[PDB]
Write a protein that binds this ligand. Structure first.
Ligand SMILES: *[C@@H]1O[C@H](CO)[C@@H](O[C@@H]2O[C@H](CO)[C@@H](O[C@@H]3O[C@H](CO)[C@@H](O)[C@H](O)[C@@H]3O)[C@H](O)[C@H]2NC(C)=O)[C@H](O)[C@H]1NC(C)=O
Ligand SMILES: O=c1ccn([C@@H]2O[C@H](COP(=O)(O)OP(=O)(O)O)[C@@H](O)[C@H]2O)c(=O)[nH]1
Lengths: 585, 582
């Protein structure tokens, strides 16, 4: 039987992977094929592949290949037989696009730190990788799965102080490691505990292996075999921060996972100084590392399904980097993911005064007051364009002759329906960044006030700037939010009437806001400003700027209900309370 | 270790951590022989190195070496090639097979089959070559650096081009290119097939075969039309009116167009297959650029169109940030490479994948202070932690102080008060527990409620300096020098640290990032510390400070001029608001 050539370490995606097979598609997902015919672990892996969106049929159309040969353990691999099987696969095609799964890539006499099969060009997902046996952009570093993750349901203990500081629960350490561990234990004592030989025994003391790891804030993983030990998964499940002492080892899924916030890597030469550098890490960093360790287990190390999904996602992001998922979605815990902001306007840019603001005036059944405000708005410098939106279909727009004479290009848009949220639609007529939403009843603003508001918005293009001042309070008697405007000691919202904000907020309101809020706010014809404030504070995670020491500008239960519903839909209340306002220097 | 002492060197085998001790990582520059021709860019690199705090004069103390010989250009036909370099590098006394030697290279190979030909045997020395193929790249030993021209700024910055983030971010064109195509040779395959996908409305691609003798010798049936089309659109106009920019492979994998595309904020679409993008192992390029495969050149425009508008906005903004943080000047590139090397010494003291790919960048974030993201003021929003509720008061003294101390202590957010008795106000102190530092001068009256308001304002803007005394800057056309304004104007760009609040990390940044010369000048003149503090804050944050309410003078101008000379530009941004309580 033919045998392919040995593992070509000089094999990368741009020379090995056949990108023609999976070129492009609207749903940027790689299609993986399952070969017809075995450990239970590989069976779970194949079921996970087949029960996901990556699985397809019609082999000639699929992109990835995962042969159905149990290669996970190399101790009973029969290297020659595996090579003969992969050659007899009859669809190898020199192994340009085939994926192999492994967790124990080591041999009895020598630890090659990689699969010993020929595997001339196949993409390998292995457990034990050294920097010399790992192809950077080609191979995927996957963890070795310990069945204890499913055999025992260790309780989800929260971060906090623990009885032990450093722990080392492994069986079979070489004397060079055990001697140093004993020396450290006798040097410090009562914090380091070393456990000797699914049960752990100390000197005249017995500990259960899964649960003893919960009492230590650190756990130490050595390199004894294949460079990758299953103790890492148990260490991460228990929550204790791993301390990898392996010399040249890349942690699993290091391509996307930020192992610096979840694990500590210490060289084997400086093993006697492990405790000294472990004292350097502060307690709150310990808490973060414990949370990251727990999240990495509950998502990538809990089951074979998680490992397979993560590996397929790695390969998919490599093949389609433009549609690749974000760093946070990879390695942010769900609690922090809810707490994360990820502001869409993240450049600290200040636009100059060359452009201006496109003022948008919402009008319906009010023309005598519209002129009084449009005349004042036109007098404001740096007004590039002014759009009047006509929500009223029953009435006809006034003739062009009677419109006031202004130096700014004016445009009147005839709406199809009468929706108060139509002021926030992103029109193609805005050629600028700043958009001034000004209401008809708003008359008590000078041109200087509008100019200063635009100038202040120049310093903060990523948030929403408005003149009116409102906030929110908590009432214990009703146990609900309330809308307060009579007194102003803090500000949490500014009404969209007389507000400077970036047009991306208009786009967000029109498209990316949840559909439950836009339709409801259109139906009740109130609290559009509250919805915009909520959305801006949610997407930017930043406060709001009031730019005038005045309250009256135009010459409660419903809004409280609006606030309560907006809090309910979001799952929390994104608004932030601040007491700083901007006025001329 | 001995087995992998070749092209397979990594830092655990072909590197010596013993020389780097703990507070080390010093860089030694070989002295000039005063008998060799050297290109201007190499003077720029060594000026960046010797101007950094990693520079040292004693070879024994240093654990990193950089050669004095011009190794940037290794092409034999190039005017800047240095002959007999192989035998010359072995004559150095401190070579030691290049155990801790860093080599900067921008070109390699001759006209036929450009390859990894540095000429001299590097041995154990890691090379920071610009165009490194993926299969020829050491995963954690070498560094991929950008390819830049001799006119690239040494210390200054061009401040990008994108002044308006207009929505939609789409522009007149979508996918543009204006570059030479090569009739014969290697590396023109991606370039000669651009006419297949050329459209003329959105995908406009331009090529010419005018590259010397072959202008009319071996021209194909398309050079005439290509040249006629080439002479209509400006390159600084179509690059600035494009959503996406192509950066294909020519003779070499890298090109100058990449940095210019980041300069123009247009999202690069790389076609150079197997190119280690500059700092690929340290910077995520899926966040600032679209990586395409030249094999599927025809299907590129559909993928470009399929990219969502929000994705385009994020890519454009990240491209601008990357250019302005790492690729703006040669000094930035050199310090980025040096810090990337440093991060691999202590695996528990280094920057994570989020610091490099987020504001302000790795150059201004020093992990020696702390590797915890919450110990910095730049990452509160990215994580889910509020800014610290307690602040530490630092008072420097050389009575009003007795009344001042009581007022500052009565604050509900005040944890402890430190009194300094004698530029020492900016050194880090282990006695400071809180992450917020209130630097207060002995002669500045500051009320308790005023302190509370200042701290609450700082809580909303932790990255900046919140302070009451504010001063402005101006430009003098009579003397072509920067000026200092102490008078009330309707503008300001600096806030004095005498009554200001800032994060504790700025102390460490001032002490371990700015070089000794500036602080020595500050000490000799006995002023100008707060001006440089504001310069550093405005450089790191790229935002103006926030002012809140409710013979010596001639030295300030010289201080500002020399700080501007060192920085190379204006970190200062003029500000025109004033936050007040409601
Ligand atoms: C910005 O708005 C988003 C909503 O689009 C907020 O995300 C939401 O955050 C809440 C918690 O604050 C999540 O509620 C949680 O739901 C899980 C079940 O999924 C439940 O087990 C928890 O006990 C909790 O109730 C909610 O799921 C989440 N929704 C989404 C779509 O992410 C986000 O928190 C807002 N940001 C700010 C700063 O307010
Ligand atoms: O019409 C042009 C063509 C090129 N360049 C500049 O020349 C360099 C690119 O050179 P070239 O296209 O020859 O690169 P290659 O084709 O050799 O890869 C960049 O700095 C461009 O800004 C330019 O300014 N105008």
């Amino acid at each position: 039987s033919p045998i392919p050539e040995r593992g070509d370490l000089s094999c990368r995606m741009h020379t090995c992977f056949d990108v023609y097979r999976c070129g492009f598609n609207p749903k940027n997902k790689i299609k993986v094929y399952i070969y017809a015919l075995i450990s239970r672990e590989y069976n779970e892996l194949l079921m996970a592949i087949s029960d996901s969106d990556y699985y397809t049929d019609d082999i000639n159309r699929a992109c990835l290949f995962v042969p159905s040969i149990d290669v996970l353990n190399q101790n009973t691999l029969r290297i020659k037989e595996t090579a003969q099987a992969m050659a007899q696969l009859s669809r190898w095609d020199r192994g340009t696009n085939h994926l192999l799964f492994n967790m124990l890539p080591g041999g009895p006499p020598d630890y090659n730190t990689a699969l010993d099969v020929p595997r001339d060009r196949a993409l390998l997902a292995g457990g034990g990788f050294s920097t010399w046996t790992y192809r950077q952009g080609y191979d995927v570093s996957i963890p070795v799965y310990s069945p204890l993750s499913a055999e025992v349901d260790l309780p989800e203990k929260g971060p906090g102080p623990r009885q032990y500081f450093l722990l080392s629960s492994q069986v079979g350490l070489h004397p060079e490691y055990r001697e140093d561990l004993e020396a450290l234990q006798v040097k410090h004592g009562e914090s380091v505990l070393v456990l000797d030989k699914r049960k752990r025994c100390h000197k005249h003391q017995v500990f259960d292996y899964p649960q003893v790891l919960q009492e230590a804030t650190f756990c130490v993983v050595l390199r004894g075999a294949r460079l990758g030990q299953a103790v890492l998964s148990d260490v991460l499940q228990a929550g204790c921060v791993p301390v990898v002492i392996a010399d040249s080892y890349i942690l699993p899924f290091s391509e996307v996972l930020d192992w610096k916030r979840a694990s500590v890597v210490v060289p084997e030469e400086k093993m006697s100084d492990v405790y000294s550098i472990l004292q350097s890490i502060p307690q709150r960093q310990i808490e973060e590392m414990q949370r990251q360790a727990r999240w990495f287990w509950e998502a990538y190390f809990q089951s074979i399904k998680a490992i397979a999904l993560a590996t397929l996602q790695i390969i998919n992001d490599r093949i389609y980097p433009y549609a690749a998922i974000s760093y946070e979605e990879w390695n942010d815990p769900p609690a922090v993911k809810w707490g994360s902001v990820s502001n869409p306007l993240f450049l600290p840019l200040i636009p100059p005064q060359s452009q201006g603001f496109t003022a948008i005036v919402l009008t319906y059944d009010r023309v005598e007051s519209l002129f009084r405000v449009i005349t004042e708005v036109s007098k404001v410098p740096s007004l590039s364009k002014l759009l009047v939106v006509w929500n009223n279909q029953n009435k006809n727009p006034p003739e062009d002759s009677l419109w006031p004479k202004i130096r700014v290009p004016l445009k009147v848009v005839r709406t199809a329906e009468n929706k108060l949220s139509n002021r926030f639609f992103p029109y193609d007529e805005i050629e600028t960044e700043a958009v001034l939403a000004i209401d008809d009843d708003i008359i008590m603003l000078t041109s200087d006030e509008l100019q200063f508001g635009y100038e202040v918005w120049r310093e903060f293009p990523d948030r929403l700037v408005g003149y009116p001042g409102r906030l929110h309070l908590w009432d214990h008697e009703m146990n609900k939010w309330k809308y307060e405007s009579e007194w102003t000691n803090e500000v949490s919202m500014v009404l969209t009437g007389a507000a400077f904000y970036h047009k991306y907020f208009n786009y967000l309101y029109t498209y990316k806001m949840p559909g439950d809020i836009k339709n409801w706010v259109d139906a009740h014809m109130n609290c559009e400003d509250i919805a915009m404030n909520f959305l801006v504070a949610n997407v930017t995670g930043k406060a709001v700027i009031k730019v005038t020491p005045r309250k009256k500008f135009k010459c409660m239960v419903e809004r409280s209900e609006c606030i309560n519903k907006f809090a309910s839909v979001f799952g929390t209340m994104p608004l932030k309370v601040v007491e700083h306002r901007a006025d001329p220097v | 270790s001995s087995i992998y002492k070749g092209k397979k060197c990594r830092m655990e085998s072909c590197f010596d951590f013993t020389l780097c001790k703990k507070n080390g990582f010093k860089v030694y520059v070989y002295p000039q022989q005063k008998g060799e021709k050297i290109a201007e860019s190499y003077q720029n690199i060594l000026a960046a190195i010797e101007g950094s705090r990693f520079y040292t004069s004693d070879p024994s103390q240093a654990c990193l070496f950089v050669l004095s010989l011009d190794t940037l250009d290794r092409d034999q036909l190039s005017p800047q090639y240095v002959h007999n370099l192989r035998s010359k590098v072995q004559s150095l006394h401190l070579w030691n097979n290049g155990r801790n030697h860093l080599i900067f290279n921008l070109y390699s190979g001759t006209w036929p089959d450009y390859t990894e030909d540095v000429g001299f045997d590097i041995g154990q020395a890691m090379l920071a070559k610009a165009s490194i193929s993926t299969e020829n790249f050491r995963p954690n030993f070498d560094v991929s650096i950008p390819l830049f021209s001799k006119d690239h700024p040494r210390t200054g910055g061009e401040r990008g081009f994108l002044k308006f983030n207009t929505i939609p971010p789409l522009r007149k064109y979508m996918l543009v290119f204006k570059g030479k195509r090569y009739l014969t040779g290697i590396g023109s395959d991606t370039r000669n097939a651009l006419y297949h996908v050329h459209n003329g409305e959105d995908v406009v691609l331009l090529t010419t075969c005018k590259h010397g003798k072959d202008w009319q010798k071996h021209k194909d049936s398309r050079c005439d039309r290509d040249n006629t089309e080439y002479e209509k659109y400006d390159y600084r106009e179509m690059l600035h009116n494009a959503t996406f920019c192509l950066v294909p492979r020519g003779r070499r994998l890298g090109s100058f167009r990449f940095l210019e595309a980041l300069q123009a904020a247009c999202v690069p679409v790389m076609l150079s297959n197997g190119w280690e993008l500059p700092f690929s192992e340290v910077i995520n390029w899926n966040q600032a650029a679209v990586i395409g495969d030249e094999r599927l050149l025809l299907q590129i425009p559909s993928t470009i169109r399929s990219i969502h508008q929000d994705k385009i906005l994020a890519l454009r903004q990240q491209t601008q940030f990357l250019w302005e943080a790492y690729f703006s000047s040669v000094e930035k590139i050199v310090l980025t490479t040096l810090e990337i090397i440093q991060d691999r010494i202590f695996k528990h003291i280094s920057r994570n994948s989020l610091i490099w790919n987020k504001h302000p960048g790795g150059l201004f974030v020093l992990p020696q202070y702390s590797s915890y993201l919450g110990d910095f003021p730049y990452y509160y929003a990215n994580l889910g932690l509020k800014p610290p509720s307690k602040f530490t008061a630092v008072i420097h003294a050389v009575q009003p102080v007795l009344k001042l101390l009581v007022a500052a202590a009565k604050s509900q957010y005040c944890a402890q008060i430190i009194v300094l008795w004698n530029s020492s106000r900016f050194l880090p102190y282990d006695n400071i527990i809180t992450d917020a530092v209130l630097s207060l001068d002995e002669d500045t009256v500051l009320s308790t409620t005023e302190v509370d308001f200042a701290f609450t304002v700082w809580q909303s803007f932790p990255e900046r300096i919140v302070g009451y005394p504010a001063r402005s800057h101006f430009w003098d056309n009579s003397k072509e020098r920067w000026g200092y304004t102490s008078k009330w104007t309707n503008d300001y760009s600096m806030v004095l640290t005498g009554a200001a609040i800032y994060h504790k990390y700025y102390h460490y940044l001032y002490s371990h990032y700015l070089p000794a010369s500036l602080k020595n000048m500050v000490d000799q003149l006995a002023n100008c510390e707060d001006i440089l503090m504001n310069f550093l804050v405005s450089a790191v944050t790229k935002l103006p400070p926030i002012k809140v309410t409710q013979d010596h003078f001639a030295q300030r101008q010289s201080c500002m001029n020399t700080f501007a000379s060192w920085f190379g530009y204006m970190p200062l941004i003029h500000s025109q608001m004033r936050l007040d309580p409601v």
